[PDB]
Design a protein around this ligand. Sequence first.
Ligand SMILES: Nc1ncccc1CCc1cccc(Cl)c1
Ligand SMILES: Nc1ncccc1CCc1cccc(Cl)c1
Lengths: 389, 395
Amino acid sequence: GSFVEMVDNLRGKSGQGYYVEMTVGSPPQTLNILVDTGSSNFAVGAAPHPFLHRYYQRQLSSTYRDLRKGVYVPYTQGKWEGELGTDLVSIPHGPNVTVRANIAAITESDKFFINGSNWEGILGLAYAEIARPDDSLEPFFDSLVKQTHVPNLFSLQLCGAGFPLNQSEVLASVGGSMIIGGIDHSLYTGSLWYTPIRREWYYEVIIVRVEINGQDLKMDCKEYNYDKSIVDSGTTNLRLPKKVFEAAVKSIKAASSTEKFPDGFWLGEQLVCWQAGTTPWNIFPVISLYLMGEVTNQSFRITILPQQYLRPVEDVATSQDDCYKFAISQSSTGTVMGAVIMEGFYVVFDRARKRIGFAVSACHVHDEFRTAAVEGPFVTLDMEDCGYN
Amino acid sequence: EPGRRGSFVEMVDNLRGKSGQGYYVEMTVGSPPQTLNILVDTGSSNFAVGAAPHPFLHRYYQRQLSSTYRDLRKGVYVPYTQGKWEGELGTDLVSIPHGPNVTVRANIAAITESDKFFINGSNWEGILGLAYAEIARPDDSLEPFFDSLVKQTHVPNLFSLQLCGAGFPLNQSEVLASVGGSMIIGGIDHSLYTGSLWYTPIRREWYYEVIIVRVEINGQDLKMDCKEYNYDKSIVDSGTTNLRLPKKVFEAAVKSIKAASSTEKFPDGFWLGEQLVCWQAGTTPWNIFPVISLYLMGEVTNQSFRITILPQQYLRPVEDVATSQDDCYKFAISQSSTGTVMGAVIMEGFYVVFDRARKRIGFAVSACHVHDEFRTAAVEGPFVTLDMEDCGYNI
Ligand SMILES: Nc1ncccc1CCc1cccc(Cl)c1
Ligand SMILES: Nc1ncccc1CCc1cccc(Cl)c1
């Protein structure tokens, strides 16, 4: 399986998001759209905004259809307001098809757009159950599969550079691949291991065990999925439930105790720098998340390195030091496997078989001593009890 | 209890006008004195008067007729988004007939050219900028009138304003005969307010800048980062008609106000503050509109207070295009790209004390605020509020 036309069709970074080019309307209006497996709405800027240098102009599209309905999407971290309608949509570097899908024309927003991100909209790839205003608004991917012969599946390879990318660099660099309707074998190494999609709303999965450098965090596995665990490319960090986060930071601190870092670092707020090339990767532990497998009483694990959970950021002085921010934070809405984590793997969203596959990414950052991994199987009992109800 | 006395009778009721065209006070300039009506503006710092013929002016400052006129041989250009005026700087003897019994020599910008500055039928021929020197044009070396007044006399460094909206439209004849409020120069008149005065600090001395720490619509917290409320600043400006809010705050507020008043549907033009809405005489549904509360930083650490206005304040009375017997209004809240602006609309609900001496602004329920039998404007406190300093904006 190889989809050369879709390989390397993404750009961006964990801190500002990964996006793919799309066109909307007739004549085609090109827009960069954030790939988000954590939401289910296709929404684009449709009015001037200081952070946008282009937006969807409905009056210029002959195929625009007004649904005469508004949609308000408030989140704890931000919000966007829009007007619903439909239009013809295509993905230049994707399947050779055009479909009529729902589009939320964003007219008002609060902390939605990111200065310098280079994207003007968002592509919610999750299910209708969480679509705004309600599940009657068919998500883009659903329209795509229903209107074409494209297989009900997509895979994502998000590629973190391992170092800071400046304004021009991030615009020229290849940030990864989104293969629509298939799996490209050149994007990963080793085997793919699948965990079931527990329920079709967010891409929900179940974590059954957590290790820090092989040491079991030893918590009731229900804590790991309280109140849910999801794969969300729309979130930067690996976010863990309060109690799990507190235990993990204690363990990570213990493992890296040869060097002390200020509280602000562990709060993911302030950066830490080291002289060029001297980042002490080896003092930081690897983190393993065991996921439910498709076989009864069987599980597998994905292991990430500090190269994944330490996010490269530019120093205020733009010096030659190598700096990073701690990309693991506290959550009140369950575990969130954000961009940070996805960068270590090729992730297959097998909608058709209700499962998510993980394989070591061909573009994950590592060193000569350790590598990310996807290994199995392991015998694990009562994994169903790890899920929250 | 104890009844509060009014000690500045000579200045009480010395204002005229309305929110839409501004409130003004009578002043005299030159020798012999030339009488002119001057717009009271806490949003600027220049004393400028028409000094040449203009279609909307019935009179103007005639420098050649004043024996005390002094030419500063300097020009001044004051452009704004909504208008501009140009003039020639100089000084002369100035007085306020219904104010302190003193005469001082102050700077006067003789307006020779203007665009969209003078308003037809406002009845004022000049402006009195009461803010600080930092925002004076051309620069802070041009001492503002109030500074001159305080430096040259024994008048206390403080003034208070009671702007009185009528609650209904006033035609040309009526607005000329009606008392529009009071400007007490050098003191506080207790007959102009009820309840207690609560003070918020003047954050910085340029505009009369304050800090809003919380906003509620009918008791419901707008729940925005308080920094948003003061982006990029929050000021008290009698020279502005509406309550203006930062874009994001306006969007959130209008949505909440719409939700609270949802039993009635209004056209987009209304919410944009552009078109009026009318109801049969006496049937304005005040009760369906929410009260709005703005919490301000108090003078005591971690303490705040709130001022609450009614729709009687934020819905501005306007005459129907058909001069019918309907009661009509325009929505007097609009967005801003220059921070929050507590304009005349809001000031009409309170007696506002500009305590320059103690770098603070006091608020109290106005004795002339419009209300109904069920609700009244209010100034209440104290409330425990933490990290209020973080609400202030810094470039
Ligand atoms: N992908 C997500 N994950 C968690 C919560 C919300 C989203 C949607 C994307 C998003 C993120 C922050 C602010 C806004 Cl306005 C929208
Ligand atoms: N007080 C103010 N507040 C905001 C902006 C400008 C002013 C000055 C008064 C004013 C009002 C309208 C037009 C002009 Cl030309 C000047």
